[PDB]
C-alpha cells in the first residue's frame with residue numbers, strides 16, 4: 001500500500017476541493033482527471049486539443065458515474081492566452097499544470113511552437129495562479145533537465161547542460177517557479193517526470209513515445225526501430241506513480257514546497273530489454289531494426305527518488321513489468 | 337590603441353557587410369548604428385519604439401554622411417512577430433540582437449511582457465538567423481545573470497540563482513544560444529553587459545538607469561535618491577567598450593564563438609562614489625537622500641574581462657571618470 005497517499009485520498013473524498021488540470025485531455029491529464037473524479041473532486045479542465053483528444057475525455061466519462069462526471073467543468077482553450085488562464089483559476093484550490101508539448105524531436109523541428117506552449121503558457125498559468133492565490137501549484141517538469149550530466153543515479157541537486165530545445169523549456173519552468181517563490185513568496189512543487197507510460201499515452205503520429213509506439217508497431221506488424229545501440233536506458237515510470245506524486249504534492253506542507261522531486265521508480269532499463277518486455281507481455285495477451293542514435297537524446301537515466309520518499313512520503317509501488325502487464329490490454333483494445 | 341579592433345574595422349571598410357541591429361532606436365542599438373554606418377556598412381534596423389525613440393535615429397543621421405545614411409533601412413516592427421524577424425533577416429551577414437525590455441523592476445511588475453519580448457522575441461530572432469544562415473549572431477546578455485553568486489570578480493563559469501524575472505530572461509537567452517550550437521551547429525556570441533552608460537541612454541521614464549537619472553536629477557536641482565546604504569557597487573561600462581565588443585564578436589574566429597563574454601572594464605564603483613563623480617563632472621559645466629534597497633537588486637558587481645582580453649583581443653579603453661566626461665555635455669545638450 002501507499003499510505004500517506006491512501007490517507008490523503010480518503011481526506012479528499014470527505015471534503016472535496018476544486019482542482020485545475022491543464023492538459024486534462026492528454027495522457028497524464030486524463031489519468032489525473034480519472035482519479036480525481038473517482039474521489040468525487042470538483043475539477044476544472046483546460047485543453048486546446050493540440051496533442052490531446054476529445055476521445056480521452058469520452059473514455060474517462062465511461063469510467064465514472066454521471067454524478068461524478070457532473071463535477072467536471074471543461075474549457076476548450078489555450079494556456080498561451082493569459083485571460084483564459086485567469087478565468088479558469090476562479091475558485092480553484094489546487095493547480096496541476098500538465099499542458100505542454102512533449103517530444104525532443106518535435107522541439108528540434110519546431111522550437112518556436114515548443115517555446116510558446118512550454119515557456120509562455122507555463123508562465124501564464126503560474127502568474128495567474130500566483131494572482132488568484134491558490135492553495136498549491138504543482139507542475140510537470142522533466143528528467144531531460146539532467147542533460148549531459150553523467151552521475152548515476154540522478155539526484156535533484158545535480159544537473160547538466162540541456163541537450164535539446166524541449167529540455168530548455170522544462171528547465172526554464174523550474175527557474176521561473178523558483179524566482180516566483182523568491183520574488184512573490186508563491187511556493188510551487190516541480191515534478192521531474194522520467195518516461196511516464198500507461199493507458200491513454202498516445203500511440204499515433206510521428207511523436208509517439210517509445211512504449212505506445214513499439215506496442216503499436218508489434219500489433220500492426222510494423223518495423224521496430226532501436227535508435228542507436230539499444231543500451232540507452234530509462235527509468236520507466238507507470239502512470240499511477242505519477243498520479244500519487246501529483247496528489248502528495250498538492251497537499252504538501254509548506255516546507256516541502258519550492259522543491260523539485262524526481263518522479264520515478266529508481267530502476268534502469270535499456271531499449272533492448274524493453275523490447276523483450278513489450279514482446280513478452282503482448283504475447284501472453286496474444287498475437288526489429290537498429291538505426292542511428294536520435295539527436296539531443298539523453299544517454300543513461302535512472303532516478304534516485306530518496307528525496308520524494310523522505311519529504312513527500314512517496315511510495316514507488318509499480319515497476320515496469322507490472323506496469324506493462326497493466327497497460328497492454330488497453331493498447332490491444334484501443335488499436336483494433 | 338585597440339589594435340585588433342582597428343584591424344577588424346579596416347577589414348569591414350574594404351569589404352562591407354550587411355548587418356541587422358535589433359533594438360536600433362535604443363541606447364546601445366543607436367550607438368552600434370552610428371559606428372557601423374561610419375564604417376560604410378549596409379544596416380537593416382528593427383525597432384518598435386517601446387523604449388526606443390525616433391529622435392535617436394534622428395541624431396545618428398546628423399552624425400554620418402548622407403552617403404552613409406543611404407545604406408540604412410529602418411523597419412518599425414516587433415521581434416515578437418516571427419514573420420517580421422524572418423523578413424529583416426533577408427541577405428543579413430551579421431546579427432547584433434539588442435532588442436529587449438530592460439529594467440529589473442519592470443520585470444517584477446510585469447513578468448509577462450518581459451518574457452514575451454525577452455524570451456519569445458529572442459528565440460524568434462535567433463531562429464530566423466539560423467534559418468537564414470547568417471555569418472554571425474551576437475546578442476545582449478546581462479551581468480544580472482551572476483545572481484546571488486558571492487565571488488568577486490565575476491567570471492563567466494560561476495553564476496548563481498537569478499534574483500529577478502529579468503535575469504531569468506537573459507540567462508534563458510544564453511541557454512537557448514548554447515542549445516542552438518549543440519543542435520544546429522549555429523555558433524553565437526553572448527555578451528553579459530555590466531551597466532553600460534553613454535550618449536543616448538534615456539534619462540526620462542520611471543525605469544531610467546542610475547547615471548542618466550542622477551545627471552538629470554542634478555541638473556534640475558531635484559532630489560537624488562540612493563536605493564540602499566549606497567554601498568551597492570557596479571562595473572560601469574562606457575558605450576564605446578560595448579561597440580568594440582559587438583564588432584570583435586561579430587568577426588570572432590570560429591573557436592571563439594559559442595561563448596559568453598563579460599563586457600565591462602573590471603573596475604568597481606559604489607553608488608556613494610558615483611554620486612560624487614557625476615556631480616564633480618557636471619560641476620565643470622556648472623548649474624542626496626537614502627531610501628530602501630531595490631527588490632532583487634544584485635549587491636556588488638565587478639567584472640573579470642580576462643576571457644575577452646584573451647579570446648577576442650578586447651582592449652577596454654574608457655573607464656568611468658573619462659566616460660562621464662564624454663557623456664556629460666550630451667546630457668546638457670539633451671535636457672536644455
Ligand SMILES: NC(=O)c1ccc[n+]([C@@H]2O[C@H](COP(=O)([O-])OP(=O)(O)OC[C@H]3O[C@@H](n4cnc5c(N)ncnc54)[C@H](O)[C@@H]3O)[C@@H](O)[C@H]2O)c1
Nearest residue numbers: 023025026027028048050051052078079099100140193196
Ligand atoms: N510522458 C512523459 O514521459 C513525460 C515525461 C516528462 C515530462 N512530461 C510532461 O508531462 C506533461 C504532460 O505530458 P503527457 O505525456 O500527458 O502529454 P500529452 O501530449 O498526452 O498531453 C499534453 C496535453 O496538453 C495539451 N496542450 C498542449 N499545449 C497546450 C496549450 N498551449 N493549451 C492548452 N493545452 C495544451 C495537449 O492538448 C495535451 O492534452 C507535459 O508537461 C510533458 O512535458 C511527460
Ligand SMILES: NC(=O)c1ccc[n+]([C@@H]2O[C@H](COP(=O)([O-])OP(=O)(O)OC[C@H]3O[C@@H](n4cnc5c(N)ncnc54)[C@H](O)[C@@H]3O)[C@@H](O)[C@H]2O)c1
Nearest residue numbers: 359362363364384386387388414415435436476529531532
Ligand atoms: N543597460 C545595460 O547596462 C544593459 C546590461 C545588460 C544587458 N542589457 C541589454 O542591452 C540591450 C539593449 O539595451 P539598451 O540599454 O539599449 O536599452 P534601450 O531600452 O535603450 O534599448 C532597447 C531597444 O529595444 C527595442 N525593443 C524592445 N522591445 C522590442 C520589441 N518587442 N520589438 C522591437 N524592438 C524592441 C526598444 O524600443 C529599444 O529601442 C537589451 O538587451 C538589454 O536588456 C543592457
Ligand SMILES: CC(=O)N[C@H]1[C@@H](OP(=O)(O)OP(=O)(O)OC[C@H]2O[C@@H](n3ccc(=O)[nH]c3=O)[C@H](O)[C@@H]2O)O[C@H](CO)[C@H](O)[C@@H]1O
Nearest residue numbers: 102103142143144193194195209210225226227294298301
Ligand atoms: C530521459 C529523458 O530525457 N526523458 C524525457 C524525454 O523522453 P525520451 O525522449 O527519452 O522519450 P521517448 O520515449 O521518445 O524515447 C526513449 C528512447 O527510446 C528511443 N526510441 C524511441 C522511438 C523509437 O522508435 N526507437 C527508439 O529507440 C529514443 O531515441 C530514446 O532513446 O522526453 C519526455 C517528453 O517527451 C519526458 O520529458 C522524459 O522525462
Ligand SMILES: CC(=O)N[C@H]1[C@@H](OP(=O)(O)OP(=O)(O)OC[C@H]2O[C@@H](n3ccc(=O)[nH]c3=O)[C@H](O)[C@@H]2O)O[C@H](CO)[C@H](O)[C@@H]1O
Nearest residue numbers: 438439478479480529531545546561562563568630634637
Ligand atoms: C549588476 C546588474 O544586475 N546589472 C544589470 C542591471 O542593472 P541595474 O538594475 O543595477 O541598473 P540601474 O542603473 O537601474 O541600477 C543601478 C543601481 O543604482 C540604484 N539606484 C537606481 C536608481 C536610483 O534612483 N537610485 C539608486 O540608488 C539601483 O537600486 C541599483 O542598485 O539590469 C540591467 C538591465 O536593466 C543590465 O542587465 C545590467 O547588466
